[PDB]
């Protein structure tokens, strides 16, 4: 079968240098050239280029040119992304792909996704967030959980270990310092708050640190 | 040299419903050499339509189109929750190789009004030197929406910081989070905090206000 | 030109039906029995060149026969 | 993937003396070895695959012209020169425009201008280098077991019996082994890069479709032509033209589309498909088939007790043999299906030759199809299928009696000798000796004379030769036949091969 | 040092050096190094008689680790012959053909 498996998500710095890996299956390795497709930042799927894998050439689109580079691995099946000179305008996911020539390809890479940011690793602020009385409205008394300045990702945010799922909602974090903050808000009926114990479980493993933080009436 | 652009960028459509995109190739004549990409966000996209007229391995026989030179059409006439996702089209013929900007899939619901709700800082955060005010805005569709932090009736856009999803995977819905960050200082030096959330549901904005005088 | 020089033929393995191949064996005879029928006049003269020289009777039809071909499109 | 129902159905007389035997296949042609010991094979190309393409270059047979531009100028002023020469995209060219005291000028009689038109592409072709290594083969291999109508002409159900096999032979691993199950093994040992000439030709892309080209020819075409990487092109001037220059007035108008003149340049080309891989229609390869592993099992199996019945009736396969299905609806099974060829009922004694070797009845589940095929002789013979009470017969005949056989040998022979090159010795395969010299004159042979004169097209090769002929007619005595060398055969032969 | 016992690999794809001979590239995935590297020029499978003669005499592994590129050339004869890297079913083997 047929399945292109490459280098997990990287955490990188400004300045630095990366050689991404696209290890492929389900066929010999030479006779498919590598298609580079970058994701930008705004979810534009920006083409990278293509190397001719025979021979071993890259063919580079011109804007990713003499930054980035195409090299190869034979015997095990592995093409290889590498990039000089890191910059933060390249935090993206980065793809590969087992070439059909002009009709472009069957099968996807995995995708790789580059982080390039100064900061300290380090664990989120997790505030258990006590709703007010304009916060109750229709029979439910809705709760959140503020995850704020945690690097890097992901963390898991459930609420009671995941026993309610319901009116939880996850949102994502974007930058701040390059540190994420995000909140989660789970919505349970005014029966069950604070009768019922509601607890924000967020798991960060990245930091080693499961924080639990039970919301309390005002 | 080809410049590409899919229309609607956004359609919301039920499902079973017909959905012809509009589209176009600049540079002329591509003969048939268009394609069509579905991407859901975080995820690399799937080959839809290759020849114009044929699917792929994988892609169901719900995909269709037609079209050569100029315009081009991705024609699914029994659109599907599964069938949520961004869409994009690629060109071959002349080099370099590049696509068009994309259209999203939106299950077409009732329009429904956000459940707004706006935290105080917690005494963790406000003991931290900081305070960040939470603004919660669950199940709301359209994805239409606009948030106004007013401190004492006066808006503040400086520390607003917006989070919201996508289309729900269970009801289909936007929801979405705003955050108003500030110094306790500056956060014990201003009353009233409230998040309006006006909506093409609510004709007028929702208002959610608490002060810190108020319990 | 594409007009001539054609890619006609392979003639590398190649046994199926080509492009064009039926219409290949009305390429040169047609369009030159054309240019005769066009050019009559010409072809009375023509093969009288054939029997002014040589008077070795058969290859002077050699001359003719062959020159005839080359006229049209010359 | 099997010989069944195939345009062109060719067959393998065994020898034995050898396991191993080098033979050559095309996608069209099926090849069908019968021999000792071994059962009735099928070999044949589906088609032949290649894997990465490279861009040699493109060709932009339709434009349009854009943005006139016409600089005019006195006479005596030498060159005239328009801004527009420096970037490549302007199509610029000098002339001239003949001046009066009443246009522009002081002078009369000549004059000086530079006209320039941004060049524009409506259309453009693609053309494709091969790699020898990315050149795949998809060979079905195919032996004859218990059959019927369906599973015959089924991959799957066979892969299930083990009987039949597909496979990828790349220069990288051009030796395959795969096995037949209870028949035993076989080894294949192809030859990928050496099958086609993977440099001696292109693929052009004209329109959608993509085509065959020689890329000798390729680079040959006049035509604007395209750079891999993006912009400057060369002779883009050939489709747009000039006209009179009438003041500062000169129209550049750009040719039609030249697509059909890209079908009117394609005369012999193959009609090429594709998706992810491109699959040839005609093929060329030279594998070697081993069958020492290959073997007879159950000939301990006896003959069966009961009545027979025919699935379908039987007709003949226009190749030289007679197939027939048969539904056994004895529940003796599983059991080795009597059957014969014979000349008179009469005569029990076995003629004609079982295509099929061994008919075996698969379980011994009654009305069981069995599809197995036989070789009857020339003549009135007759289809026996079963021994005592037990046999329902059928009458044949088959007009292709050995004399049209041995032309049909011989003429198709020259036949498998033309357009086969060198490679036509390897249908005389275990060769050495007479079959290693053979292809060895006709290598340098191959090597020179029709290849060096080659490229002739039809009646330009055939007419010659009837003149060529002549060179027979006027000789000398003990130099006779070396005016008449060339002359008869290698030369008229491919001109009556090919008619039409 | 004798024969290795294990798979190979082709770190680069064979060619022509244009000069005559051809040179391959090889991994070797194999523990059992430092040995000898087994290899052949050979006119058919069937014969397993060297014909064509190594550019470089006795190819040998540097190390024990695995998947080591070893670079050796060889010269095949004239005609259709066979690059064979390894004996017994361990054997990946090319096709080569020389019209000089």
Same mark, same amino acid.
């Given at each position: 079968?047929?399945?292109?498996?490459?280098?997990?998500?990287?955490?990188?710095?400004?300045?630095?240098?990366?050689?991404?890996?696209?290890?492929?299956?389900?066929?010999?390795?030479?006779?498919?050239?590598?298609?580079?497709?970058?994701?930008?930042?705004?979810?534009?799927?920006?083409?990278?280029?293509?190397?001719?894998?025979?021979?071993?050439?890259?063919?580079?689109?011109?804007?990713?040119?003499?930054?980035?580079?195409?090299?190869?691995?034979?015997?095990?099946?592995?093409?290889?992304?590498?990039?000089?000179?890191?910059?933060?305008?390249?935090?993206?996911?980065?793809?590969?792909?087992?070439?059909?020539?002009?009709?472009?390809?069957?099968?996807?890479?995995?995708?790789?996704?580059?982080?390039?940011?100064?900061?300290?690793?380090?664990?989120?602020?997790?505030?258990?967030?006590?709703?007010?009385?304009?916060?109750?409205?229709?029979?439910?008394?809705?709760?959140?959980?503020?995850?704020?300045?945690?690097?890097?990702?992901?963390?898991?945010?459930?609420?009671?270990?995941?026993?309610?799922?319901?009116?939880?909602?996850?949102?994502?974090?974007?930058?701040?310092?390059?540190?994420?903050?995000?909140?989660?808000?789970?919505?349970?009926?005014?029966?069950?708050?604070?009768?019922?114990?509601?607890?924000?479980?967020?798991?960060?493993?990245?930091?080693?640190?499961?924080?639990?933080?039970?919301?309390?009436?005002? | 040299?080809?410049?590409?652009?899919?229309?609607?960028?956004?359609?919301?459509?039920?499902?079973?419903?017909?959905?012809?995109?509009?589209?176009?190739?600049?540079?002329?004549?591509?003969?048939?050499?268009?394609?069509?990409?579905?991407?859901?966000?975080?995820?690399?996209?799937?080959?839809?339509?290759?020849?114009?007229?044929?699917?792929?391995?994988?892609?169901?026989?719900?995909?269709?189109?037609?079209?050569?030179?100029?315009?081009?059409?991705?024609?699914?006439?029994?659109?599907?929750?599964?069938?949520?996702?961004?869409?994009?089209?690629?060109?071959?013929?002349?080099?370099?190789?590049?696509?068009?900007?994309?259209?999203?899939?939106?299950?077409?619901?009732?329009?429904?009004?956000?459940?707004?709700?706006?935290?105080?800082?917690?005494?963790?955060?406000?003991?931290?030197?900081?305070?960040?005010?939470?603004?919660?805005?669950?199940?709301?569709?359209?994805?239409?929406?606009?948030?106004?932090?007013?401190?004492?009736?006066?808006?503040?856009?400086?520390?607003?910081?917006?989070?919201?999803?996508?289309?729900?995977?269970?009801?289909?819905?936007?929801?979405?989070?705003?955050?108003?960050?500030?110094?306790?200082?500056?956060?014990?030096?201003?009353?009233?905090?409230?998040?309006?959330?006006?909506?093409?549901?609510?004709?007028?904005?929702?208002?959610?206000?608490?002060?810190?005088?108020?319990? | 030109?594409?007009?001539?020089?054609?890619? +006609?033929?392979?003639? /590398?393995?190649?046994?199926?039906?080509?492009? =064009?191949? $039926?219409?290949?064996?009305? !390429?040169?005879?047609?369009?030159?029995?054309?240019?005769?029928?066009?050019?009559? +006049?010409?072809?009375? /003269?023509?093969?009288?060149?054939?029997?002014? =020289?040589? $008077?070795?009777?058969?290859? !002077?039809?050699?001359?003719?026969?062959?020159?005839?071909?080359?006229?049209?499109?010359? | 993937?099997?010989?069944?129902?195939?345009?062109?159905?060719?067959?393998?007389?065994?020898?034995?003396?050898?396991?191993?035997?080098?033979?050559?296949?095309?996608?069209?042609?099926?090849?069908?070895?019968?021999?000792?010991?071994?059962?009735?094979?099928?070999?044949?190309?589906?088609?032949?695959?290649?894997?990465?393409?490279?861009?040699?270059?493109?060709?932009?047979?339709?434009?349009?012209?854009?943005?006139?531009?016409?600089?005019?100028?006195?006479?005596?002023?030498?060159?005239?020169?328009?801004?527009?020469?420096?970037?490549?995209?302007?199509?610029?060219?000098?002339?001239?425009?003949?001046?009066?005291?009443?246009?522009?000028?002081?002078?009369?009689?000549?004059?000086?201008?530079?006209?320039?038109?941004?060049?524009?592409?409506?259309?453009?072709?693609?053309?494709?280098?091969?790699?020898?290594?990315?050149?795949?083969?998809?060979?079905?291999?195919?032996?004859?077991?218990?059959?019927?109508?369906?599973?015959?002409?089924?991959?799957?159900?066979?892969?299930?019996?083990?009987?039949?096999?597909?496979?990828?032979?790349?220069?990288?691993?051009?030796?395959?082994?795969?096995?037949?199950?209870?028949?035993?093994?076989?080894?294949?040992?192809?030859?990928?890069?050496?099958?086609?000439?993977?440099?001696?030709?292109?693929?052009?892309?004209?329109?959608?479709?993509?085509?065959?080209?020689?890329?000798?020819?390729?680079?040959?075409?006049?035509?604007?032509?395209?750079?891999?990487?993006?912009?400057?092109?060369?002779?883009?001037?050939?489709?747009?033209?000039?006209?009179?220059?009438?003041?500062?007035?000169?129209?550049?108008?750009?040719?039609?589309?030249?697509?059909?003149?890209?079908?009117?340049?394609?005369?012999?080309?193959?009609?090429?498909?594709?998706?992810?891989?491109?699959?040839?229609?005609?093929?060329?390869?030279?594998?070697?088939?081993?069958?020492?592993?290959?073997?007879?099992?159950?000939?301990?199996?006896?003959?069966?007790?009961?009545?027979?019945?025919?699935?379908?009736?039987?007709?003949?396969?226009?190749?030289?043999?007679?197939?027939?299905?048969?539904?056994?609806?004895?529940?003796?099974?599983?059991?080795?299906?009597?059957?014969?060829?014979?000349?008179?009922?009469?005569?029990?004694?076995?003629?004609?030759?079982?295509?099929?070797?061994?008919?075996?009845?698969?379980?011994?589940?009654?009305?069981?199809?069995?599809?197995?095929?036989?070789?009857?002789?020339?003549?009135?013979?007759?289809?026996?299928?079963?021994?005592?009470?037990?046999?329902?017969?059928?009458?044949?005949?088959?007009?292709?009696?050995?004399?049209?056989?041995?032309?049909?040998?011989?003429?198709?022979?020259?036949?498998?000798?033309?357009?086969?090159?060198?490679?036509?010795?390897?249908?005389?395969?275990?060769?050495?000796?007479?079959?290693?010299?053979?292809?060895?004159?006709?290598?340098?042979?191959?090597?020179?004379?029709?290849?060096?004169?080659?490229?002739?097209?039809?009646?330009?090769?055939?007419?010659?030769?009837?003149?060529?002929?002549?060179?027979?007619?006027?000789?000398?005595?003990?130099?006779?036949?070396?005016?008449?060398?060339?002359?008869?055969?290698?030369?008229?032969?491919?001109?009556?091969?090919?008619?039409?």
């Amino acid at each position: 079968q047929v399945q292109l498996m490459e280098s997990g998500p990287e955490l990188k710095k400004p300045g630095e240098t990366v050689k991404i890996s696209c290890t492929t299956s389900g066929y010999t390795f030479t006779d498919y050239a590598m298609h580079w497709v970058k994701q930008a930042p705004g979810k534009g799927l920006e083409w990278m280029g293509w190397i001719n894998t025979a021979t071993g050439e890259p063919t580079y689109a011109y804007d990713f040119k003499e930054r980035f580079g195409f090299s190869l691995e034979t015997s095990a099946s592995t093409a290889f992304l590498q990039i000089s000179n890191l910059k933060i305008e390249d935090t993206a996911t980065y793809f590969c792909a087992s070439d059909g020539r002009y009709w472009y390809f069957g099968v996807w890479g995995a995708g790789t996704s580059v982080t390039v940011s100064s900061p300290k690793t380090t664990p989120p602020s997790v505030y258990p967030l006590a709703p007010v009385c304009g916060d109750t409205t229709g029979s439910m008394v809705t709760l959140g959980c503020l995850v704020k300045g945690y690097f890097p990702e992901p963390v898991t945010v459930t609420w009671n270990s995941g026993s309610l799922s319901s009116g939880v909602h996850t949102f994502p974090a974007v930058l701040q310092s390059d540190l994420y903050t995000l909140s989660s808000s789970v919505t349970v009926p005014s029966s069950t708050w604070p009768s019922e114990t509601v607890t924000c479980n967020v798991a960060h493993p990245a930091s080693s640190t499961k924080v639990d933080k039970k919301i309390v009436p005002r | 040299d080809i410049v590409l652009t899919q229309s609607p960028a956004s359609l919301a459509v039920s499902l079973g419903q017909r959905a012809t995109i509009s589209c176009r190739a600049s540079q002329s004549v591509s003969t048939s050499y268009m394609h069509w990409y579905q991407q859901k966000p975080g995820q690399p996209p799937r080959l839809l339509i290759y020849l114009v007229s044929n699917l792929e391995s994988g892609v169901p026989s719900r995909f269709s189109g037609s079209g050569s030179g100029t315009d081009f059409t991705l024609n699914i006439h029994p659109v599907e929750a599964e069938d949520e996702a961004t869409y994009y089209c690629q060109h071959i013929r002349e080099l370099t190789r590049s696509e068009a900007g994309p259209s999203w899939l939106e299950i077409k619901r009732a329009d429904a009004a956000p459940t707004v709700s706006i935290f105080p800082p917690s005494s963790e955060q406000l003991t931290s030197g900081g305070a960040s005010v939470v603004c919660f805005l669950n199940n709301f569709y359209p994805k239409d929406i606009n948030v106004k932090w007013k401190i004492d009736g006066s808006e503040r856009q400086n520390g607003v910081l917006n989070s919201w999803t996508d289309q729900d995977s269970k009801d289909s819905t936007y929801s979405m989070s705003s955050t108003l960050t500030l110094t306790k200082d500056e956060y014990e030096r201003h009353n009233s905090y409230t998040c309006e959330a006006t909506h093409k549901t609510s004709t007028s904005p929702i208002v959610k206000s608490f002060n810190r005088n108020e319990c | 030109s594409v007009s001539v020089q054609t890619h +006609g033929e392979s003639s /590398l393995v190649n046994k199926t039906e080509t492009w =064009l191949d $039926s219409t290949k064996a009305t !390429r040169y005879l047609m369009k030159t029995e054309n240019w005769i029928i066009r050019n009559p +006049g010409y072809a009375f /003269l023509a093969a009288v060149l054939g029997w002014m =020289l040589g $008077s070795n009777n058969g290859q !002077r039809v050699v001359f003719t026969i062959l020159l005839l071909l080359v006229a049209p499109a010359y | 993937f099997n010989c069944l129902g195939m345009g062109n159905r060719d067959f393998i007389e065994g020898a034995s003396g050898a396991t191993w035997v080098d033979l050559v296949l095309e996608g069209d042609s099926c090849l069908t070895i019968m021999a000792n010991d071994k059962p009735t094979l099928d070999v044949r190309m589906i088609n032949i695959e290649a894997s990465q393409l490279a861009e040699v270059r493109s060709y932009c047979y339709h434009a349009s012209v854009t943005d006139i531009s016409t600089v005019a100028r006195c006479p005596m002023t030498g060159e005239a020169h328009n801004e527009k020469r420096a970037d490549s995209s302007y199509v610029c060219k000098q002339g001239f425009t003949d001046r009066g005291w009443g246009n522009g000028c002081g002078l009369f009689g000549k004059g000086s201008i530079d006209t320039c038109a941004k060049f524009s592409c409506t259309s453009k072709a693609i053309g494709r280098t091969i790699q020898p290594e990315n050149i795949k083969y998809e060979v079905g291999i195919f032996v004859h077991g218990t059959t019927t109508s369906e599973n015959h002409g089924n991959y799957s159900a066979q892969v299930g019996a083990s009987q039949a096999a597909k496979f990828t032979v790349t220069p990288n691993a051009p030796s395959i082994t795969l096995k037949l199950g209870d028949y035993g093994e076989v080894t294949l040992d192809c030859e990928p890069r050496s099958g086609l000439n993977t440099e001696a030709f292109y693929v052009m892309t004209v329109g959608s479709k993509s085509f065959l080209v020689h890329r000798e020819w390729f680079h040959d075409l006049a035509l604007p032509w395209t750079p891999p990487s993006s912009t400057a092109w060369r002779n883009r001037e050939l489709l747009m033209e000039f006209e009179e220059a009438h003041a500062t007035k000169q129209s550049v108008v750009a040719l039609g589309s030249q697509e059909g003149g890209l079908h009117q340049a394609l005369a012999g080309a193959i009609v090429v498909e594709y998706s992810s891989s491109v699959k040839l229609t005609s093929g060329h390869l030279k594998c070697r088939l081993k069958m020492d592993k290959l073997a007879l099992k159950g000939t301990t199996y006896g003959m069966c007790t009961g009545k027979f019945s025919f699935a379908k009736n039987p007709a003949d396969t226009g190749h030289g043999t007679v197939v027939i299905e048969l539904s056994y609806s004895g529940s003796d099974g599983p059991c080795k299906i009597p059957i014969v060829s014979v000349a008179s009922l009469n005569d029990m004694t076995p003629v004609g030759r079982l295509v099929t070797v061994n008919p075996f009845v698969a379980t011994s589940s009654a009305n069981s199809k069995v599809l197995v095929e036989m070789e009857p002789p020339f003549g009135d013979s007759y289809i026996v299928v079963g021994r005592g009470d037990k046999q329902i017969n059928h009458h044949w005949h088959k007009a292709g009696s050995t004399l049209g056989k041995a032309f049909l040998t011989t003429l198709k022979g020259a036949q498998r000798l033309a357009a086969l090159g060198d490679t036509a010795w390897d249908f005389g395969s275990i060769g050495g000796v007479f079959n290693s010299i053979g292809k060895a004159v006709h290598q340098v042979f191959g090597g020179a004379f029709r290849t060096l004169f080659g490229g002739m097209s039809w009646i330009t090769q055939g007419l010659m030769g009837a003149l060529l002929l002549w060179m027979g007619v006027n000789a000398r005595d003990r130099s006779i036949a070396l005016a008449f060398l060339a002359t008869g055969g290698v030369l008229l032969f491919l001109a009556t091969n090919v008619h039409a």
